[PDB]
Every structure is written in structure tokens, then in C-alpha cells.
């Protein structure tokens, strides 16, 4: 099912095995480094990311000490970090907008798992330049980069907010509206695993 889909839930407790395999996973975790709902480092280590892919890529936003922690989780989950995207934050004039240096950028680790095949490696470059939207928002160019890399494939975002829903993407987050699912096999395995629409233990 090509158009957006999402699942309001707690990503800690949802049974992601019902969702199937994805060519791309993306995650903007709420690392404990609290203004929103944070997750401890063991909770992050424990997320069942390994079930979501057999071959493909993981995009993992990091800041501060998660830069090292996210490298850990990425290896723990079975990936090799093969690239790193930085987003240079500008204004509308395209000038540039951590107690030692002011931070003009945000980092996104790129991990590979297995032997992904038929992707378009090399189409983009590891630098995004784009204006800041709201606080805490990734730039939208990341989805265009990801689509050029793996066109038409199943992609899943972890810890999205409603502004993150995207065609070809399934967005999981705890501030989304309900459960909107259109992929048949997913609607199936969801009804089988949750015959009553509550995600609990």
C-alpha cells in the first residue's frame, strides 16, 4: 500500500514482528542526554530493530553522547556504519544558524545490514543544507534522499510525529492519531496479534 500509514503506540511495547521487512529503517530516537518522553540507554539497546530488516539500510539521528551510543546500538542491532549524513542548518538567507563550539549541524548515522541489492548508491552526497522548520524536526530532504536510494520499497520510521507520515512509509510514534493501516498483510497480522486494538506488555 503506497500511501502513508501510522501506528500510535509505545515503541518499547509494540510487537514489530507483525510489520514485516523493510528496505529502509529510519529513527530519530529521544535519547536521554527531559523535555519529552525519553528512553533509557538499555531501553534503546533493547528495541527489536533486528527483526525489521534482512537486507537494507538504517538511518539513525544522533546528538551529543548518542553519537557514541547510537554507534553502539547500530552495531548491537547488526549493522555496519557505512556513511554519516550531516544537515547544515541555515536560515532563509542561507547563512549558518556542546559547550565548546556552537552547533551548525546535526548528524545521521547510516547503517547497512546484510547484502542490499538494487539500490542507487552514490546518487546524493552526505551533506544536506536546508532551513530549520519547527524545533526538533528533521529536514524533509532526507525522505527524498532515501527515495532516490531505494525507490518504491517498504520503509519504516521509528519515533515519528504526525508531520513525518510519508507515502511508502509506516510511521510509529506515541503522538499519532490512532492506527491507520492499509497494507493487507499488515492489517492481517495486526488483527491476529491484537484482536482488540490495545498494545500492552
Amino acid at each position: 500500500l503506497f500511501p502513508p500509514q501510522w501506528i500510535c503506540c509505545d515503541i518499547r511495547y509494540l510487537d514489530v514482528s507483525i510489520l514485516g521487512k523493510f528496505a529502509v529503517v529510519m529513527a530519530d530516537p529521544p535519547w536521554d542526554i527531559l523535555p519529552y518522553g525519553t528512553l533509557t540507554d538499555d531501553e534503546m539497546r533493547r528495541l527489536n530493530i533486528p527483526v525489521l530488516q534482512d537486507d537494507g539500510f538504517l538511518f539513525l539521528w544522533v546528538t551529543g553522547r548518542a553519537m557514541e551510543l547510537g554507534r553502539e546500538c547500530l552495531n548491537l542491532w547488526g549493522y555496519e556504519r557505512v556513511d554519516e549524513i550531516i544537515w547544515v542548518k541555515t536560515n532563509q538567507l542561507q547563512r549558518i544558524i556542546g559547550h565548546w563550539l556552537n552547533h551548525g549541524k546535526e548528524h545521521c548515522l547510516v547503517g547497512v545490514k546484510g547484502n542490499p541489492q538494487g539500490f542507487n548508491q552514490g546518487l546524493d552526497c552526505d551533506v544536506i543544507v536546508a532551513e530549520v522548520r519547527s524545533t526538533s524536526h528533521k529536514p524533509d530532504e532526507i525522505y527524498g534522499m532515501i527515495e532516490r536510494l531505494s525507490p518504491g520499497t517498504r520503509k519504516i520510521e521509528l519515533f515519528g510525529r504526525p508531520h513525518n507520515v510519508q507515502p511508502n512509509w509506516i510511521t510509529l510514534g506515541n503522538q499519532l492519531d490512532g492506527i491507520h493501516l492499509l497494507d493487507p498483510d499488515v492489517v492481517a497480522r495486526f488483527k491476529q496479534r491484537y484482536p482488540d486494538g490495545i498494545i500492552s506488555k
Binding site: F57, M67, E68, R71, E80, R81, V82, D83, E84, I85, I86, V88, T90, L93, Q94, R95, I96, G98, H99, W100, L101, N102, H103, G104, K105, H107, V110, V112, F119, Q121, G122, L123, D124, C125, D126, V127, I128, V129, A130, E141, G144, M145, R148, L149
Partner: protein
Amino acid sequence: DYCQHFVDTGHRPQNFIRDVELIRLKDELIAKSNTPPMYLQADIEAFDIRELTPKFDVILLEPPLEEYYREKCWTWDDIMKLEIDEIAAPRSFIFLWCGSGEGLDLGRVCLRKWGYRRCEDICWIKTNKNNPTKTLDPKAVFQRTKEHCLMGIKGTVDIDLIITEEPEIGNIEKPVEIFHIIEHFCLGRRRLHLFGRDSTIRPGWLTVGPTLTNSNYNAETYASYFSAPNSYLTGCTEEIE
């Protein structure tokens, strides 16, 4: 969408960044505080590093990675075996150029191996306004247009970005801007640059490298610049009368 645009025209998104309180008195203070430049040709693989004294407030480490030569290289194997912590002061800083590949991970292992924790990640973003096409590392997913210089601290104004135009093929120099970022931190005056060259020698710094053509290093002369009453100068105050 500058990422769609680069996909269109070969102009990396950074090609379009514009502009890439005047208290330049700190620059003059740095300059009057700067020890004479010292330098020593040395094969660092074969060089007992402990002969370098006293312990350094700043270490800048620029090993020649194999990836710098696309068209002796040091591996992260060789680098990780350098006894950097035997010459670093108990409170001190490291700035380590990690390239853009495995270095971003292996260089973090070095920083921890030698005793530092990373506090800054400083990116050299390379524009190509003067040549909108490049060949990729096999593992690469994207085109690599930047290099990383990791900043490490052990013990108790500027952005984290340098934007210049990509150097000519086979030129390995790093932007001199890194020296300005370091010097404005005001971290002390014992400043060491391992794997520098004739072209990087600089006031306020001791350079050690295989390719230096001359030396002037003398440990007693060098330690003399820091004997009392100058042992704790940040590098950003007046010379004591």
C-alpha cells in the same frame, strides 16, 4: 531542495551556503603569547614518542590515511598503536582528523584508548563550485563531500564547521582554519602537531613528521618556553612582564 538540485547539476548543496562584534584582539593576544615555531623530522612509526617533552596541552593528529590518496599510508591499525597518552598532559585536548569512512568509528576507539571523551565533532565540508563527479568507496551509500576532525578532552565563538572548496586531486592539506578553531579555545601553550609538514609549521606549535626537511627541536630549549612564571598560560593573555 538542494539535494534534488545536486542530483540535477552536480553542485553539492554546500556550494550555496552564504557567508562561508569584532574581537580580533584575542588573535593578537594569541600571537604575542606564541612560542617560536619548532619542528623535528622523525619517522613516527619507528620513533619512540616519549622523547617528546614536556606533556602537551593540545595534540593535533593528522595521519596520512589511505583514503587521502585516491588518485607510506597509515592504517587505523598503526594509528591505534600510537602511545598518544604517554605524551598528553593530564588535562589536555586532542584534535584527530578521521577522514570520512571507517575513521569516524576507529578514531573514536583511539580517543577512548588514549583517555579522551569526545566533546566536539568538527566537519570540513568541501564545496565544488569550481568543478560540478567523484568515485566512491565500495561500502559508500552516498557521495562523500566532507571530512571529520574529532575533538577529545581528558581531565577537568566558533562553529563546528569549516567550509572551503575541495582541494586539487592529491593535495592532502587540511584547512588552516582548524588551527584558528584550536587557538581560540585558549587551551594552553604546549601544542603538538603530529604528521605536520614544512607547509604547516606555525608559531605556537611543535610539528613532528616524517617529511619535514629541517629540524630545530631541542627538548630543553622547548621546555624553557614554559618554565615559571609561564607554566599555566592559556595562550590568550599577556606575556608576564
